Amino acid sequence: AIPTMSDVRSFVARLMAEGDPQQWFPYRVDQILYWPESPFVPPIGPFYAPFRPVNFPFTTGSYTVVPDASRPLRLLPQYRNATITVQQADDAYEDTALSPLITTHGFC
Amino acid sequence: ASRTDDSATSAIVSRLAVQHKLSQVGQASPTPPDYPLLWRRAKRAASMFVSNPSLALQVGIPVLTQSGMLSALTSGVGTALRTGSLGKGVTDASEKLRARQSLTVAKQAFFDQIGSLWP
Amino acid sequence: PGLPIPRRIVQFGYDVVHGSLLDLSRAVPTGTFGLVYADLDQVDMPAANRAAIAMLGTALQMTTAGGVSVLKVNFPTRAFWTQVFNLYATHATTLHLVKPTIVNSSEVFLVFGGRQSNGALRSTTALQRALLSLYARNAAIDRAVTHIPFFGVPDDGTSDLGIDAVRLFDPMFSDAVANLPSNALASLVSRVVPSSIMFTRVPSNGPVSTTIYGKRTFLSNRRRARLRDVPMLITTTLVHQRRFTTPPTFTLFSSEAVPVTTLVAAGYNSFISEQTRNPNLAHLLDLGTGPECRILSLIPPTLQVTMSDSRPCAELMASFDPALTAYVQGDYSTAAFWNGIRCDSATAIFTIGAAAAAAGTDLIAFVQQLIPRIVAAGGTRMWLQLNTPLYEVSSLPDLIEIDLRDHVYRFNGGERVEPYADPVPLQQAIAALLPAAALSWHTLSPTCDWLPYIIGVGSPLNLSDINTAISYSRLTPILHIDTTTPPLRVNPVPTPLNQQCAIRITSLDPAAVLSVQHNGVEVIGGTPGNVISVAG
Amino acid sequence: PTGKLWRPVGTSVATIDSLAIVSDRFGQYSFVNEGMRETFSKALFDINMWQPLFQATKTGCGPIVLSSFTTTTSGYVGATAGDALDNPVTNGVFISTVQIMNLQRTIAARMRDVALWQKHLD
Amino acid sequence: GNVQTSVNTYNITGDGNSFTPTSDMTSTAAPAIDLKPGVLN
Amino acid sequence: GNVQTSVNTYNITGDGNSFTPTSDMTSTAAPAIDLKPGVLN
Ligand SMILES: *C(=O)CCCCCCCCCCCCC
Ligand SMILES: *C(=O)CCCCCCCCCCCCC
């Protein structure tokens, strides 16, 4: 609610990170194209054109905010349909896995 | 020839409905069309046909001999073939599969003797 | 409680700090005592034996005539057991080994009865059994601990119990797309299925990292191996989160000791594991596996098994090779289900009890219809986690209540109620079903050799509960049938302790070795001529 | 051309013996002649069609492009060193064995998926 | 027939749809794909 | 099975051969080649 420098910076950082510049709504200098099939209702004047991309992936609805989990939450695994091939589903892991991972033992 | 309410027995069901539905029009309409009973009645109708094609010529055969059916059936079966996809074999491709493993297990048994007798 | 308050206590040892410092190896300059509790350590084996034989010699010296010396041997070797029963073959009247297993060590305690000069402490078969049980467990406890990494060593892929994670940065878990972030999620969960899989999201002032660790054990390596492909996970639940949790931990073990019930369950996952490991077993089915086949981890990645359950299977059955793994829905309690399902061996562990309760039927009457179906299903072997009080009709206060008005149990008094049978009635009912088949009751053996399933998956426990579970395992044995061999013949039937009984194994070849073992320790072994028996 | 692709094992000079089926960690690249792409495209085309039902039911995994199972190797492609020598193909489109496996089991897995829905639609 | 909206470019109960067979276009797909040994290669 | 050596890249009695059918690759040459008038041209 009250953006703090630490936070603003964590957003301006996320913005800089290499990614794909959204392409559904092309940019104009005097008009903001707004999805017709979207909650936003244009003001009045000549600044909002009701442009409709060929295939916008977003649907509407909101999200009720949930407080920060006090501890790592376990996640039961429920499967999908497509399956990756052992070869590809391996390096995929080995490209982002924490290999020499330091770990505590605790008491057995 | 399975409980899969196929395109054939389906073309007929739509006729029985449209038929039994207007015969209910005018008068108390005390009987809302069935459907679970219609699907099953048309299933044996399409089935009785595949069975003994001839019957559809004899006066007194349930469903099959009303003018709609057949003219109906065929034109269904028609478009039905022109869309089968390729994997139509998915039907009972479970027991069919389990039967193939059954054979390879017995054939593996053969190779096992070829493997011993002639060492 | 039970022990009276001693007049005075005189301390000794190497760092007493309140009494003189003595060295029990040599002679002592002090007077006698009723109780001379000795607890000194012996520690490189022969002189170590001398050390012990000597220490006990002076400790069994400091005791008042008619006292109680309590030495503690570190390595009760059959090298010291000759010297002890020779030198002090007289010194005391009674003698008991009191091995208190706190950790894995072979140091046992010996107490001497009446410190009277003319005693006769002869080495008995008890000792052979006691001593033998001890070791039988260190192989079990050691083999078990092998699955654990050495402290302070960076986690590699080598360690069996190693915790492997996958940290992604602002991962875009997308459904229907094999994008890396969602692709890594696959492997990870595949590499640690029966485990935990904990996902976290810590917000750095930069991006938002999201590690997703899990305790990769050997129970996953067995499962993952059977996998032909790595299925995807419905990333919706993950995509929903959008809240920061605490940072990951990466700890081989959880913090609390598993429920007495798990000590027992992980006592069969080791048993079914060892049974299914048998080659000739071939095709096996599981009547009522979990909603998600939990048996796939306890089977050699080559055996062809077919788990079944009323509920739908949790794992995408497609990822497993159809030939090797099959899945049938619907219950086995219903006659229909048994059409076209032939397996040479069935296993009804964890279900058989719930079916009798679900089908609201009598336990004996239930298996009365199941066993014959397995025979028809074409089954040579059978394993059913039946719940009958074969050891005693005595129950556990909090774990299982045995309502006697109606043959039934109450696991956690209420949480679930399942009917039971009796050792004898159910025994003869099954023997009447399969007359030629040989029956046998396998139960969680005190050797705790099953351990590489509790300490192996990374779960704490109470060395005191092993007792509870070896008593909870006795309330629900695993009746192992085997139509492939002739059954035994016990002349007393409800065989009473201390009575000579006639047992007859019908084997065509006289050139065989009889070796009856009870508790995971052999007790009677030897061809007809010579038979070493520690059971009597 | 047709058959598996070969390459001069002895290097440079490609004669009727300095060739050898270019096999490797992926299996052997077999050439995908023009018409044989018509089939695998016609097969995948009939699956992509069911795109709206794959997303709806969270199965599938995106549209199956045949250009995901092939490659752009180049060499001589024939049935035997002798005759493969007369088919120098550059940057042809070959599908490796292990791939000829997926394009197979994918079209098979997806084929089940649709074969089912496709039956209800009917 | 409940409204969807974007999942697919057409609503079923959508405005002005129209079932209407034409002897001209016999509906659909691709069943006879050739795969036999000689013909697939 | 007498050793040959070069005529063909494989010896029959050669080292580590292996008969082993796989439900996966149904052995097949090219029998159904299409040659009928309309289809061959
Ligand atoms: C909402 O689902 C009401 C039902 C209307 C359509 C259901 C299916 C029957 C029509 C099929 C349309 C797609 C091809 C037949
Ligand atoms: C030497 O010729 C001994 C015989 C061994 C092979 C003879 C033919 C039988 C095996 C056929 C191998 C090629 C394909 C069947």
Side-chain angles (χ1 to χ4, degrees), chain A, chain B, chain C, chain D, chain E residues 1-3 5-7 9-41, chain F:
Chain A
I2 291 177
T4 178
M5 293 193 80
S6 180
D7 145 50
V8 169
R9 177 177 175 178
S10 85
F11 181 103
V12 109
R14 249 181 291 137
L15 239 193
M16 287 297 87
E18 296 184 357
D20 294 44
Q22 152 275 172
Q23 273 174 1
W24 301 292
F25 300 97
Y27 157 91
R28 311 296 171 180
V29 168
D30 303 301
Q31 283 176 43
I32 304 176
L33 321 181
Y34 66 93
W35 202 29
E37 225 80 83
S38 178
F40 171 109
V41 183
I44 293 179
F47 282 177
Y48 291 84
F51 170 100
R52 185 174 332 187
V54 163
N55 259 300
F56 206 32
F58 311 64
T59 55
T60 116
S62 56
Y63 287 128
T64 41
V65 188
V66 164
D68 303 51
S70 78
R71 72 102 155 300
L73 62 176
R74 96 188 184 195
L75 143 153
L76 284 179
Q78 295 179 292
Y79 301 98
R80 208 174 100 246
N81 229 271
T83 70
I84 304 307
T85 58
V86 187
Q87 280 183 34
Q88 151 197 172
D90 242 303
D91 59 299
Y93 155 109
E94 312 165 313
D95 276 305
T96 46
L98 240 49
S99 251
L101 178 65
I102 294 123
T103 101
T104 304
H105 289 251
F107 302 104
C108 70
Chain B
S2 43
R3 247 178 333 174
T4 69
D5 288 301
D6 60 71
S7 62
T9 93
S10 185
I12 298 164
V13 158
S14 58
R15 289 291 179 295
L16 297 194
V18 160
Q19 184 274 299
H20 157 292
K21 219 291 193 310
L22 72 64
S23 78
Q24 190 62 318
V25 155
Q27 192 180 1
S29 69
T31 311
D34 213 78
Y35 299 156
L37 173 148
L38 289 236
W39 277 109
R40 174 177 47 277
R41 178 189 311 146
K43 187 91 182 75
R44 77 177 306 160
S47 179
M48 178 177 267
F49 172 86
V50 167
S51 186
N52 177 59
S54 175
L55 279 195
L57 304 194
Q58 306 166 48
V59 189
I61 274 307
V63 186
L64 267 194
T65 60
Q66 293 177 290
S67 57
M69 284 52 98
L70 289 163
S71 195
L73 159 85
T74 65
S75 80
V77 179
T79 90
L81 304 194
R82 271 168 285 124
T83 25
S85 250
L86 210 105
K88 172 204 101 169
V90 72
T91 310
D92 301 289
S94 171
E95 300 180 0
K96 200 193 313 302
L97 193 204
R98 188 274 319 301
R100 281 206 200 70
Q101 274 155 307
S102 167
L103 292 182
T104 181
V105 149
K107 171 173 302 172
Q108 169 51 194
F110 162 52
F111 291 147
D112 288 307
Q113 300 158 303
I114 287 280
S116 57
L117 309 200
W118 294 265
Chain C
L3 188 67
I5 300 175
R7 162 56 49 170
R8 66 186 175 191
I9 293 177
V10 178
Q11 297 185 60
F12 295 122
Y14 288 59
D15 4 303
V16 49
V17 181
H18 281 106
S20 53
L21 295 62
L22 308 174
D23 292 27
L24 274 269
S25 72
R26 299 189 178 183
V28 177
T30 60
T32 51
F33 310 95
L35 176 173
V36 179
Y37 178 96
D39 195 46
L40 295 175
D41 301 358
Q42 313 320 306
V43 169
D44 105 288
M45 182 46 116
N49 266 149
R50 185 62 182 182
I53 288 299
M55 298 191 89
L56 185 167
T58 91
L60 213 180
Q61 220 67 283
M62 300 189 279
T63 54
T64 294
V68 183
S69 38
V70 191
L71 198 286
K72 156 197 157 177
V73 176
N74 245 65
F75 307 104
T77 50
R78 119 193 159 314
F80 143 114
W81 280 111
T82 5
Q83 282 295 171
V84 59
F85 279 136
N86 169 275
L87 298 188
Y88 329 116
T90 34
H91 296 187
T93 294
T94 100
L95 192 167
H96 330 214
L97 302 178
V98 189
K99 179 64 178 72
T101 58
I102 322 286
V103 182
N104 188 194
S105 68
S106 65
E107 62 133 295
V108 310
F109 288 68
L110 318 76
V111 293
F112 289 94
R115 165 52 178 155
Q116 65 161 50
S117 60
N118 306 89
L121 311 188
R122 174 176 318 195
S123 52
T124 64
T125 336
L127 173 57
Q128 174 64 357
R129 187 207 334 174
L131 200 52
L132 221 165
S133 304
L134 180 163
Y135 298 118
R137 171 158 38 174
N138 277 46
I141 298 181
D142 180 290
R143 112 180 61 165
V145 160
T146 305
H147 300 316
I148 308 178
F150 285 95
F151 295 83
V153 68
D155 180 63
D156 201 59
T158 303
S159 60
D160 181 353
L161 249 184
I163 294 182
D164 55 356
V166 168
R167 177 179 303 179
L168 310 149
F169 280 96
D170 296 353
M172 179 180 83
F173 306 102
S174 187
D175 304 23
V177 183
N179 62 319
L180 191 286
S182 173
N183 229 53
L185 204 297
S187 344
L188 178 75
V189 172
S190 172
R191 300 190 155 208
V192 199
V193 167
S195 237
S196 195
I197 299 180
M198 323 199 97
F199 148 92
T200 62
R201 275 188 53 189
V202 169
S204 176
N205 79 311
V208 180
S209 72
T210 76
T211 58
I212 314 177
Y213 47 110
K215 304 178 187 184
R216 166 205 63 204
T217 58
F218 72 157
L219 266 184
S220 63
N221 293 311
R222 269 178 180 174
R223 189 270 198 178
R224 175 188 169 190
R226 171 171 294 283
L227 273 178
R228 230 182 190 183
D229 304 298
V230 181
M232 296 293 86
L233 300 77
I234 310 175
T235 71
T236 63
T237 68
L238 281 178
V239 171
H240 183 76
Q241 303 308 78
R242 91 177 88 69
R243 68 187 171 178
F244 306 113
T245 70
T246 42
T249 59
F250 313 112
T251 306
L252 291 314
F253 298 102
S254 43
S255 52
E256 339 88 309
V258 297
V260 173
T261 303
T262 69
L263 286 177
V264 175
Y268 301 147
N269 282 180
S270 60
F271 160 96
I272 296 178
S273 156
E274 179 176 58
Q275 291 300 359
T276 295
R277 207 181 355 177
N278 176 315
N280 69 24
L281 199 60
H283 186 282
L284 159 81
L285 94 157
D286 206 285
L287 313 188
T289 195
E292 51 162 23
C293 325
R294 169 52 179 160
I295 189 179
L296 288 187
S297 304
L298 302 40
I299 296 174
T302 55
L303 178 159
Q304 173 179 9
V305 57
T306 77
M307 31 229 70
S308 62
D309 179 54
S310 60
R311 314 162 52 188
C313 199
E315 322 185 335
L316 184 62
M317 294 315 300
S319 58
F320 301 86
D321 159 35
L324 260 50
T325 71
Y327 182 86
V328 186
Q329 276 179 54
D331 289 320
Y332 58 84
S333 185
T334 73
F337 164 75
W338 297 79
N339 287 301
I341 49 167
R342 61 184 186 183
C343 321
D344 64 61
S345 58
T347 165
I349 288 189
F350 249 82
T351 312
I352 185 60
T361 52
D362 164 32
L363 197 285
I364 300 183
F366 184 99
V367 200
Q368 197 188 325
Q369 168 201 284
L370 192 160
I371 295 176
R373 287 187 183 181
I374 293 298
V375 181
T380 67
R381 339 266 181 169
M382 280 188 282
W383 296 296
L384 348 165
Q385 176 180 31
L386 297 172
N387 45 189
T388 99
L390 76 178
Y391 247 89
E392 315 192 316
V393 181
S394 183
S395 66
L396 298 179
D398 185 30
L399 293 310
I400 302 175
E401 193 57 13
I402 313 175
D403 184 307
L404 271 181
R405 297 190 175 186
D406 300 319
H407 301 288
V408 68
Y409 282 162
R410 278 171 180 169
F411 306 87
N412 303 48
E415 283 172 47
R416 66 184 183 188
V417 178
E418 317 186 310
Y420 69 73
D422 329 301
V424 29
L426 188 286
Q427 186 69 0
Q428 311 150 319
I430 291 186
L433 209 296
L434 318 180
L439 315 167
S440 57
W441 305 91
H442 308 194
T443 60
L444 203 62
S445 58
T447 65
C448 66
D449 63 349
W450 67 73
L451 257 199
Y453 277 92
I454 301 174
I455 298 182
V457 180
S459 300
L461 46 60
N462 292 10
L463 299 172
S464 55
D465 292 355
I466 314 176
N467 224 48
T468 315
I470 296 174
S471 180
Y472 181 125
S473 188
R474 294 181 179 187
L475 255 290
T476 63
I478 295 185
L479 184 271
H480 166 200
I481 306 181
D482 192 42
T483 69
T484 89
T485 65
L488 278 165
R489 316 184 196 186
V490 197
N491 258 307
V493 184
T495 87
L497 175 73
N498 304 310
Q499 279 195 319
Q500 184 189 348
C501 53
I503 303 173
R504 342 199 57 164
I505 309 167
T506 36
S507 181
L508 74 187
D509 69 299
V513 233
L514 177 276
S515 52
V516 183
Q517 52 118 61
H518 123 83
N519 268 177
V521 185
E522 50 175 36
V523 202
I524 307 172
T527 316
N530 304 344
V531 176
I532 305 174
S533 44
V534 182
Chain D
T2 307
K4 337 222 75 119
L5 123 115
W6 318 40
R7 266 203 286 271
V9 137
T11 304
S12 298
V13 58
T15 310
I16 300 175
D17 41 18
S18 96
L19 298 187
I21 303 269
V22 183
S23 180
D24 80 294
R25 68 162 326 308
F26 279 114
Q28 286 168 24
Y29 300 83
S30 78
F31 182 52
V32 172
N33 67 80
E34 227 314 74
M36 178 226 216
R37 140 183 293 81
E38 244 50 275
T39 313
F40 303 161
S41 207
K42 218 181 298 290
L44 296 180
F45 174 71
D46 184 61
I47 300 179
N48 296 309
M49 201 187 314
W50 292 95
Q51 196 43 32
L53 218 24
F54 274 119
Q55 313 171 316
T57 70
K58 284 310 114 29
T59 152
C61 44
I64 311 157
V65 191
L66 180 44
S67 66
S68 95
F69 298 106
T70 56
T71 77
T72 298
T73 332
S74 32
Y76 296 109
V77 49
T80 98
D83 87 82
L85 196 37
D86 309 52
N87 295 288
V89 74
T90 308
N91 287 306
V93 50
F94 307 71
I95 170 177
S96 66
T97 301
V98 64
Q99 277 315 269
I100 256 169
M101 257 329 107
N102 309 337
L103 168 68
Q104 194 285 78
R105 266 178 302 77
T106 277
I107 275 174
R110 290 294 140 291
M111 230 32 148
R112 182 188 70 284
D113 303 322
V114 55
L116 295 231
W117 306 320
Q118 183 271 297
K119 140 179 179 179
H120 289 299
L121 174 59
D122 186 65
Chain E
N2 266 347
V3 181
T5 202
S6 260
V7 215
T9 35
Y10 294 121
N11 241 68
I12 203 185
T13 59
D15 209 318
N17 284 307
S18 59
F19 175 86
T20 165
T22 160
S23 65
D24 207 87
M25 187 54 69
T26 266
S27 56
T28 64
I33 298 203
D34 187 308
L35 302 186
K36 293 176 181 166
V39 205
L40 222 184
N41 119 266
Chain F
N2 266 347
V3 181
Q4 214 78 29
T5 202
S6 260
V7 215
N8 322 312
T9 35
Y10 294 121
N11 241 68
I12 203 185
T13 59
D15 209 318
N17 284 307
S18 59
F19 175 86
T20 165
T22 160
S23 65
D24 206 87
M25 187 54 69
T26 266
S27 57
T28 64
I33 298 203
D34 187 307
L35 302 186
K36 293 176 181 166
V39 205
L40 222 184
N41 119 266

